[PDB]
Design a protein around this ligand. Structure first.
Ligand SMILES: OC[C@H]1O[C@@H](O[C@H]2[C@H](O)[C@@H](O)[C@H](O[C@@H]3[C@@H](O)[C@H](O[C@H]4[C@H](O)[C@@H](O)[C@H](O)O[C@@H]4CO)O[C@H](CO)[C@H]3O)O[C@@H]2CO)[C@H](O)[C@@H](O)[C@@H]1O
Ligand SMILES: [Ca+2]
Ligand SMILES: [Ca+2]
Length: 270
């Protein structure tokens, strides 16, 4: 009834599938993903109560030494749907067929109910991201003709990579009320093309619905990549990046009670 992963007990890369019907196809996949931490004291723990429906992340890390300061953040504990293209983990038991080529995909809403509690001014975000790859089922990383898209609905003390391009309006739902929100658009070349959308009014808790195609359509429009609509939307990842090169302790807790992807009857890109 309860799934738990823990760093450092489970190794360098704790992770597990959420497979509530035990059918061998996960609905979601969880990872602690401390990808830029070389060593730390303390622990990080992610639990998922299958019975009550709550994901709870608890982190108390100290003595943090990074693998590369130039990566800036320490890690990205997360839950995702689809095929994460950095490893052999995947979750495909859901209504949206990911991976699929962006030219063939439905638009969809993403709704998340959550609460964030970073401690002591820890720099964090709450970021949704997707990777867009040239092959359908990538498991060995990302190339320079591919894209990373993030959507930050909370942040404190972090800025996206690269340069600010523009601001856009995206209609979202916040705590049940539809509302025009503003997103900053940022773009970088970091070994692949990176496009980030950073809300101008961060939301530290509640229920938020976003239209995924509004973001992928702007990412397509501003891209420098050839043949963009041939790329595959591999996954949708939801997690909190945290830390800076100056951060040596990182205590954080969060909860997610619901993630829903709702297909629409319209193309992703418009
Ligand atoms: O699963 C076990 C296998 O793990 C392999 O290592 C993987 C690791 O699982 C995976 O989680 C890691 O992914 C990170 C990716 O989350 C991160 O994304 C960044 C992004 O680059 C950055 O631009 C944006 O700002 O933030 C994102 C979130 O913080 O990117 C880094 C690459 O820079 C990824 O490392 O990828 C690992 C491989 O690099 C082990 O290799 C394997 O042995 C093991 O069996
Ligand atoms: Ca399943
Ligand atoms: Ca994978």
């Amino acid at each position: 009834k309860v799934l738990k992963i823990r760093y450092p007990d489970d190794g360098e890369w704790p992770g597990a599938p959420i497979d509530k019907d035990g059918d061998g196809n996960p609905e979601f996949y969880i990872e602690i993903n401390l990808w830029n931490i070389l060593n730390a004291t303390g622990f990080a723990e992610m639990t998922y109560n299958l019975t009550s429906g709550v994901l709870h992340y608890v982190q108390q890390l100290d003595n943090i030494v990074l693998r590369d300061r130039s990566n800036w953040v320490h890690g990205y504990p997360e839950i995702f749907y689809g095929n994460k293209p950095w490893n052999a983990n995947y979750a495909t038991d859901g209504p949206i067929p990911l991976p699929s080529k962006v030219s063939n995909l439905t638009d969809f809403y993403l709704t998340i109910s959550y609460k964030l509690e970073p401690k002591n001014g820890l720099p964090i975000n709450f970021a949704i991201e997707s990777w867009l790859t040239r092959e359908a089922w990538r498991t060995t990383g990302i190339n320079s003709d591919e894209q990373e898209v993030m959507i930050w609905i909370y942040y404190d003390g972090l800025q996206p990579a690269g340069s600010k391009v523009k601001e856009i309006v995206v209609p979202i739902i916040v705590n049940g009320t539809p509302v025009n929100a503003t997103f900053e658009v940022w773009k970088a070349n970091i070994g692949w093309e990176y496009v980030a959308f950073r809300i101008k009014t961060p939301i530290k808790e509640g229920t938020v619905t976003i239209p995924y195609g509004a973001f992928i359509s702007v990412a397509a429009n501003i891209s420098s990549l050839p043949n963009y609509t041939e790329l595959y939307l591999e996954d949708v990842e939801i997690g909190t990046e945290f830390g800076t090169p100056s951060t040596t302790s990182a205590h954080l807790e969060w909860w997610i009670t619901n993630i829903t992807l709702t297909p629409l009857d319209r193309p992703l890109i418009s």
